Design a protein around this ligand. Sequence first.
Ligand SMILES: CNCc1ccc2c(c1)[C@H](NC(=O)C(=O)Nc1ccc(Cl)c(F)c1)[C@@H](CNC(=N)N)C2
Ligand SMILES: CNCc1ccc2c(c1)[C@H](NC(=O)C(=O)Nc1ccc(Cl)c(F)c1)[C@@H](CNC(=N)N)C2
Lengths: 336, 335
Amino acid sequence: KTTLFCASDAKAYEKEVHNVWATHACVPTDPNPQEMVLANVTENFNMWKNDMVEQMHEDIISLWDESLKPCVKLTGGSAITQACPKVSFDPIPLHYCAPAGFAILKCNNKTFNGTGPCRNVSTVQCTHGIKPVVSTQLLLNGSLAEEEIIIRSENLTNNAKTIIVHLNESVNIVCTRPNNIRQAHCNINESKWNNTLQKVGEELAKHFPSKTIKFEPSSGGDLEITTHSFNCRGEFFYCNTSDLFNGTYRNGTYNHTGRSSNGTITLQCKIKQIINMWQEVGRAIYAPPIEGEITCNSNITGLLLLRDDTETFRPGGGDMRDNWRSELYKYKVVEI
Amino acid sequence: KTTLFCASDAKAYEKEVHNVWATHACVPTDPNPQEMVLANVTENFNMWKNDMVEQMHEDIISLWDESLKPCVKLTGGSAITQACPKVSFDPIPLHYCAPAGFAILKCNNKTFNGTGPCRNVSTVQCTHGIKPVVSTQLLLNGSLAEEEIIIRSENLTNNAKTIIVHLNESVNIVCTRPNNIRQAHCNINESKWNNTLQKVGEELAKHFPSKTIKFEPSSGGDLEITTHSFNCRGEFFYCNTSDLFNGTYRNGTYNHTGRSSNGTITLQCKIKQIINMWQEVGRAIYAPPIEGEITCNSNITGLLLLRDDTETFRPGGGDMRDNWRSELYKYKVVE
Ligand SMILES: CNCc1ccc2c(c1)[C@H](NC(=O)C(=O)Nc1ccc(Cl)c(F)c1)[C@@H](CNC(=N)N)C2
Ligand SMILES: CNCc1ccc2c(c1)[C@H](NC(=O)C(=O)Nc1ccc(Cl)c(F)c1)[C@@H](CNC(=N)N)C2
């Protein structure tokens, strides 16, 4: 336990809300941090029980609270109104650093699954640059696994626990609302996606021995988790993924059963004004979408899954603490 | 044409020289940016013939003249000496704005090459925030193409003319003189560089039917142009790029023949005191480098190339007006 502090390359002249936030909350990053490599030592990590995740969660909640002010905030029977101006929105990498008297241990084992023993260890003052990207089903613009795809879970035999898939090669996704003003769409190359779900398919095949491994859409619930929901330029995008998570892996080969056109999977997206908040239990209401072309070009670097003869996996999400876990898995706050 | 005026978020209690200059030379940026989108309006652009570049160049010359004072300045055979204190140096974004009666037309075509027809244009009072980064070969801390790498030249078939490559994704470069006090070095991830040079190689392959596209170092000349020269915290870095611009593109793929060690290209750099000035024809001598760790973490946002079966390309630069053109290419002053 300690109280971490943040570092970033935020610009004071930038009116983008992440830059404003980091300027009023963080410290100038050090242009050349140097890692103290600890060989010979073997310590244990648990990405699922990490306070760094809670601190970061708190910080991102405060950030959204001060940056994205909704027209309405409804909780129970009480509603709160205030000015909801359109803003400049684009996440910047956040570093989390330990104060004097504390250190940050970093796992260098490159196939480490987040829980248990890690042996190539090291000492850093601050973490790597982390973009606080809030999304569901798909993890966007994070860091890639440097070798094979990695499966992360608090308990894999417990189907109620969220599975994090760390990809080794990103899959580009391009969402856009062209110049219906709430109708948007995402484009994904079907080849990269087929390859990706092939690799993820076999990596899941290893953990679940002789099963037909299917990928199906989210069963139901709030649109935030039943769709790939995310924030693009201050606008809340909800993108249908029924043609994305639609496949079958069996006997060492994968088959995409989702619809595609000319080698491209297109997600039908909707920009919503009424959102179910991730910070707290309640609803937030924002202004109609801005004018012009609203496009986000992102990289899919991770998956969020939930497991149900056959093993079926569906896209998950909703708890952003897992989104922070996908990047904070290699770190651990330590005493000196 | 007119007499433009600058606007910035420059800050009067900052002793950083860009701020010191901008506070007394510029105007508070304006909380009210109002863009005027236009339908049915072609205007023709020529980034290579834009006076805004000349004005910018001139007051960047003024800025440097008042900020970075060399111990000696030799021009025309005449030597001028003065105090050469080490200062705080870090570029800030400058906006260029049109006075009363004038406006700045802005191209919105995301793939506009600087020259020729542009349709989707708006009207602004001031340009975007531009950091006056003086450099050769590599363009640092600039804007990225909103996507698709862009090739710029007033005539590509004219080998004598500087090519500006506008990148869509930045390539981080970390230069450092560690705590020989003139020996420095730069670090660049090789993967991002081979990626960049491959895509650039193919967008070059488009303009050049299909010859073998080679990347070779600068043939010769002053160190300022034969190396990636730039200023970091007041100190003049000259970094070798013989292992950066050295590779071959053939077969629709590129392979790097430049040398590397475990995924990291390291440029051998030298902090120099005697400098061939970019402001004018002459030389300036400064004081020895400051003590401590001298590090700059920059982003490569563009390239400056020169073209010689095979088309050979080499890093170029020297004329900083080209460094202003890569950012001012989309704007034009009108009445
Ligand atoms: C199986 N997991 C179910 C679960 C588990 C935990 C939580 C949720 C769902 C709820 N998450 C969210 O509403 C949420 O992320 N919205 C959201 C908003 C904007 C963007 Cl861009 C976005 F990508 C997502 C949240 C509770 N809130 C309410 N019940 N109203 C916390
Ligand atoms: C093919 N183009 C050749 C060309 C064309 C025009 C010009 C040059 C070269 C000369 N540029 C420079 O000396 C120059 O940029 N130095 C410089 C200083 C500091 C930093 Cl940080 C830096 F990155 C560069 C300059 C003439 N001056 C002298 N010959 N003394 C103008």
